[PDB]
């Protein structure tokens, strides 16, 4: 089997991407944030505290003839950005782009933090990191990909995120028309439950490539690119007037600037992030100070290849017995 679904930016900055997901019988379609940095599939639901729902589409398990309470199971998750959610668990039929999993754990939110409430466009998350991170207790549950894997033509999914435009998540096959040149594959460590890999270095604009190992995670659920302070300082030093602002919470730059590109290494290959991808617009409406899309990972504890990086590539998440990651230009 295979699946193929379009993923769409939630706003004009590509702050996140939503992908339609069919849950239950008859189908209830929710727009979920596919997140390769976590491993819970959770949804706004009929059980979500009413004051914490503001425009989201909810899953109502009582209206699904295939929903079954997973007795005794609860979940609770906290994300790197400080947001959180928790609730109980149903199993139900879940389909993504024509690919169907029966008996998928659908984690029903009883509580969500304010950032989720305030984002009416995201109806929940669909985790695509390794199932070892799944938060369901007392019986850990498998991700959608884990459950689908054996049925897939090939045990892979791919992320093809658009810049200010829709893109695609494919399951079970590699679309050879979706990228240019060849795919370069690189080793993955699953020791932290992430799609963790080591970049071979970077360049700023037309500058020379610096060979240096940068360990980080491929995370579709993080907006920006978070890298060591040395790397990030080198990038923003090439933008006149750029500075790190503690009050804003990162590097800002004059909105009048032309940003340089940023290149990262995948083995001997090179992925180029155009400068425009690194512009996240005025810090507040009407401001001439703009927020940077490359930020320091210092104090996160891990480097994160988020959407800013991933949307510059066609990315293969290879879930073979020994997982690997592939990157191609496009």
Swiss-Prot record:
Q: What positions constitute the catalytic site? A: 35, 199
Q: What class of enzyme is it?
A: hydrolase
Q: Which UniProt keywords apply?
A: Aspartyl protease, Disulfide bond, Hydrolase, Protease, Signal, Zymogen
As recorded in UniProt, its EC number(s) are 3.4.23.22
Question: What molecular functions are annotated in GO for this chain?
Answer: aspartic-type endopeptidase activity
Q: Which reaction does it catalyse?
A: Hydrolysis of proteins with specificity similar to that of pepsin A, prefers hydrophobic residues at P1 and P1', but does not cleave 14-Ala-|-Leu-15 in the B chain of insulin or Z-Glu-Tyr. Clots milk
Has the keyword Hydrolase been applied to this entry? yes
Top-level taxon: Eukaryota
Which GO terms fall under biological process for this protein? proteolysis
In this UniProt entry, which cysteines form S-S bonds? 255-290
User: Where is the Peptidase A1 domain positioned along the sequence?
Assistant: 17-328
Q: Which family does it belong to?
A: Belongs to the peptidase A1 family.
What this protein is called in its record is: Endothiapepsin
Q: What is the lineage of its organism?
A: Eukaryota, Fungi, Dikarya, Ascomycota, Pezizomycotina
- Coverage span on the entire protein: 90 to 419 of 419
């Amino acid at each position: 089997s295979t699946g193929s679904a379009t993923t769409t930016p939630i706003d004009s900055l590509d702050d996140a991407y939503i992908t339609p997901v069919q849950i239950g019988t008859p189908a209830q379609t929710l727009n979920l944030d596919f997140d390769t940095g976590s491993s819970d599939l959770w949804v706004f639901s009929s059980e979500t505290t009413a004051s914490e729902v503001d425009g989201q589409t909810i899953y109502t398990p009582s209206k699904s003839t295939t929903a079954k309470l997973l007795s005794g199971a609860t979940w609770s998750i906290s994300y790197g950005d400080g947001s959180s959610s928790s609730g109980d668990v149903y199993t139900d039929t879940v389909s993504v782009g024509g690919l169907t999993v029966t008996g998928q754990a659908v984690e029903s939110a009883k509580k969500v933090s304010s950032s989720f409430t305030e984002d009416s466009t995201i109806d929940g998350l669909l985790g695509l990191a390794f199932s070892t991170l799944n938060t369901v207790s007392p019986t850990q549950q498998k991700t959608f990909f884990d459950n689908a894997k054996a049925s897939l033509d090939s045990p892979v999914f791919t992320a093809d995120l658009g810049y200010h435009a829709p893109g695609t998540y494919n399951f079970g096959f590699i679309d050879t028309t979706a990228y240019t040149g060849s795919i370069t594959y690189t080793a993955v460590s699953t020791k932290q439950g992430f799609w963790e890999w080591t970049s071979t270095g970077y360049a700023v604009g037309s500058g020379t490539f610096k060979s240096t190992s940068i360990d980080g995670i491929a995370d579709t659920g993080t907006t920006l690119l978070y890298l060591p302070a040395t790397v990030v300082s080198a990038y923003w030093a090439q933008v006149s007037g750029a500075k790190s602002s503690s009050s804003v919470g990162g590097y800002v730059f004059p909105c009048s600037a032309t940003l340089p590109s940023f290149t990262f290494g995948v083995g001997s290959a090179r992925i180029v992030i155009p400068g425009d991808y690194i512009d996240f617009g005025p810090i507040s409406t009407g401001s001439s100070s703009c927020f940077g899309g490359i930020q320091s990972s210092a104090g996160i504890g891990i480097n994160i290849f988020g959407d800013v990086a991933l949307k510059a590539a066609f990315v293969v998440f290879n879930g073979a017995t020994t997982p690997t990651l592939g990157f191609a230009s496009k």
